Amino acid sequence: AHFPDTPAFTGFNAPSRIECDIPNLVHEGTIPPELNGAFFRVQPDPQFPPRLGDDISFNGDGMITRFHIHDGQCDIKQRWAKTNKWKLENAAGKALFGSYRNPLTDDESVKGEYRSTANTNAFVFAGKLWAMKEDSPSLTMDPATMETFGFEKFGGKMTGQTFTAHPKVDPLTGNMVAIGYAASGLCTDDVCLYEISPDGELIYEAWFKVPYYCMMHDFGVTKDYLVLHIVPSIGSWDRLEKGLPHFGFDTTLPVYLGIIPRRADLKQEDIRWFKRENCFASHVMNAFQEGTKVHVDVPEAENNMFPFFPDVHGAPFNPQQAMSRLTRWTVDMASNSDEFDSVTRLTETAGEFPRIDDRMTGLPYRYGWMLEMDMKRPVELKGGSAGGFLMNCLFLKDHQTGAEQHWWCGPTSSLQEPAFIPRSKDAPEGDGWIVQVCNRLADHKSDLLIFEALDIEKGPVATVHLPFALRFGLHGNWANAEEIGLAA
Amino acid sequence: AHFPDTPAFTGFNAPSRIECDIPNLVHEGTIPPELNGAFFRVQPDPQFPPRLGDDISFNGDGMITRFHIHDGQCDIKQRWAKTNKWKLENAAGKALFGSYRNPLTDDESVKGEYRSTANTNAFVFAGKLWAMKEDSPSLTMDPATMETFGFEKFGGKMTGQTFTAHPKVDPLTGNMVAIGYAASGLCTDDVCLYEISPDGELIYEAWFKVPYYCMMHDFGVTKDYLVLHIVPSIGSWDRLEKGLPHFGFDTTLPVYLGIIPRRADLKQEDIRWFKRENCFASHVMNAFQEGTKVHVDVPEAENNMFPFFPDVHGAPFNPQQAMSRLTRWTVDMASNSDEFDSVTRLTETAGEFPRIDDRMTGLPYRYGWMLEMDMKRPVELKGGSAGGFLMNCLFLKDHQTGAEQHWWCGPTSSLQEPAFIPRSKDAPEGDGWIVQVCNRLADHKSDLLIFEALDIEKGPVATVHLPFALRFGLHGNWANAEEIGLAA
Ligand SMILES: COc1cc(/C=C/c2cc(/C=C/C(=O)O)cc(OC)c2O)ccc1O
Ligand SMILES: COc1cc(/C=C/c2cc(/C=C/C(=O)O)cc(OC)c2O)ccc1O
Ligand SMILES: [Co+2]
Ligand SMILES: [Co+2]
Ligand SMILES: [Co+2]
Ligand SMILES: [Co+2]
Ligand SMILES: [Co+2]
Ligand SMILES: [Co+2]
Ligand SMILES: [Co+2]
Ligand SMILES: [Co+2]
Ligand SMILES: [Co+2]
Ligand SMILES: [Co+2]
Ligand SMILES: [Mg+2]
Ligand SMILES: [Mg+2]
Predict the structure, then answer these.
(1) Counting atoms of ligand 2 from 1, which one is nearest the CA of B373?
(2) Beta carbons of B351 and B313 less than 8 angstroms apart
């Protein structure tokens, strides 16, 4: 393959495309014998060179990595998420779909097809592996063989065109709660709220509209509500016609927080929209209710975090203003005005990729983990981030005491998103382990790190070496072996 | 897996164990559209940590790499050679066989089993891939799927216990010509000469004895003769009982060259043994007859080239004396004495891993390629050699004119054995391409280089990037697609 000599395709961003199997990876330390299951994660990784001769990181085909941990060892299986895009391009031997979220640039032969790269999450639910991309229905895969099933349209009961890559599982019911924005077509203001039974059946789909079309990448869920931030990374057909990146950030638009009832009978009039001054937030650590209030914890930045989705008025990217810090947004459903009740920074550590013990989804909670950008640490090698942030620490916040733990990966490495592994179904919050990929940039390889989740400062208890490098990853999740067809 | 923190298992020698598939590897330059076939090569690569807690490079399980070149692209498939050792250890989840060529160190449960790691050659013949190790019958594999068949004992017609990893194909008949030393048991002085029909049937097996048991790793073949050098890397059960490496070099023993008729009716009295002063040679570039003389071209060193098979009298390894230079040994079958007719250095370039256009096997020939150790070149990174030689150039010798070509891989790389690809069955000698793996040590990855075989100084015409590193390799070979079940 002849790939471009551009940053999106060179160095740490060289295409990999490895499908492989390796049991019993070389490792150091002690892999807890308690562990029996697998950590799935996804990297964008281009099957073919881009039609345009350049592209962005977020547009690579999804490659799924599974780390099966069992018997004190770690195995890897890596396979493509075989989206319709992947299959059509594989058959043609070339790229057919064009630039990011831009159907104007697709070959005529794929007009109307799902454009998904299934590249943003590798999530386990209802016995399936979900390889997810927010512009289409999710792909599903067999979590044991990692063969691909196809797109999940729930027996035709789903009528929205899209499905999120940030599904939540409600611990009270076991339902998956999801959204799909641009639900009636590209750049539309329609959104669907979906709930899916533990057995994989669509329970309901509820339609509503948002203040403006924007990247609705993540969201929170509480007992009663979908908690949907409206942040002005905006797109339009006009941008696409002009050849601009689909999304661009508008510093002049307000940010909203929508509180949408989790009800099949939802009507637009049931929604409350709270409004605040412009800022940027993407991911949600968790949301929960307290009395008539809703709290959602997000890494908030002063301005855009996506340099490749630039300021719509032509401003150069501002890295300092892109530093996000975990912040609690509180709204009161009983409040008279549309103002937020409070906005409260929860840490001065800058960070992103927030995670919780997912048993606490929607509930008051004590612990959160993040990737931290610690700009005071030495750096001899940089890499691993699509936007150029160096994620060099694992951070744990204790909301009860305020305490913070930090673990730095050293001066030639960077880190990928952590994932929490509960010790058992009924173990206390945070009792378990954290796993995450570490980019060993000087060695051009990756490790899987395993930490005791509440004692990270001493470093990982096991380090699993991969004999090759993973690419930049997005989201990942642990599932116990019995949830994924792997051995007891 | 917990592997030792010793040189045989760290850095460039970290275990890899990658089984993978990647079509359409990222590449630069122009892969000749003429190419349609595959280059196979093998790396020792330990499935499990060694029983003893340390080991040598030559003892790793064979991992077979196939580079399928077709349609101007290169694909990789990598799979284990599933020897009986591999299978038994895989089932047990641990190492069962011990140190190199030392059955005293095996678990009792594998007493009597073939100890082969099939780690020394990946050779194509009779529609099969042969994964070869000189202590056992060869393993065979499907060259298209790379599944393993098992050990080839030729329908029970083979009675020797061993089979070489340096098979030759006689261009006059298409037969494979092979030896098997230690043919009646470990450290025995019995050797078999085998010829195998193009259809894979054993034609004959002829037994003889050699002056002393030693590592009979390679040999030459001519129209009439097996040409067998006897070089005193010697082994014994006494060494094994003392816990010494199986082989050690004895500077006090003579070197012989045996000229053994290629005849099923061979008797010991038919063999001529020529004798010379001690030296070291391992590989054979080619051998051929001229009148009543036999010529064989070998990289000759003053002393041992294997530091891990040390001097038997306790001398420290001498790297300067380990420098080998291609040298023609000539004996005359009509000569009265046992002296060689001539010993003539053919180049002052130090090098090893000699290769020819294999259509010239046994014939007078013009071209030879080697890996050169050019000690005058700068080196910022070292790696890639089991004995510590830096193989940093590709070298071509023209025996007609004397001319030499050199291509240096640069200061952070090293090279693996080249292999010649003929343009067509009837093309002139040397008309075709050279392929070889290049270790990009600073990048912790490997490339496959493709050269115009007689114009190497301009560098490779294509560079195929692998997104991971291969380990040190031994021998490899190209086969056309129609010889290996791959597409026309
Ligand atoms: C893969 O495709 C999509 C991805 C996403 C989101 C990715 C994401 C990435 C980062 C990277 C940080 C670093 O590298 O330091 C940060 C974020 O929030 C601040 C993000 O929301 C959105 C649409 C896609 O189509
Ligand atoms: C894999 O197992 C076996 C291998 C061989 C031979 C390997 C070989 C290696 C080198 C390496 C050079 C470097 O690294 O620079 C040089 C040689 O001749 C001078 C050799 O004959 C022999 C027995 C085995 O059991
Ligand atoms: Co996300
Ligand atoms: Co404006
Ligand atoms: Co920190
Ligand atoms: Co590592
Ligand atoms: Co679980
Ligand atoms: Co050899
Ligand atoms: Co002696
Ligand atoms: Co040279
Ligand atoms: Co490369
Ligand atoms: Co051929
Ligand atoms: Mg269904
Ligand atoms: Mg047979």
Answers:
(1) 15
(2) no
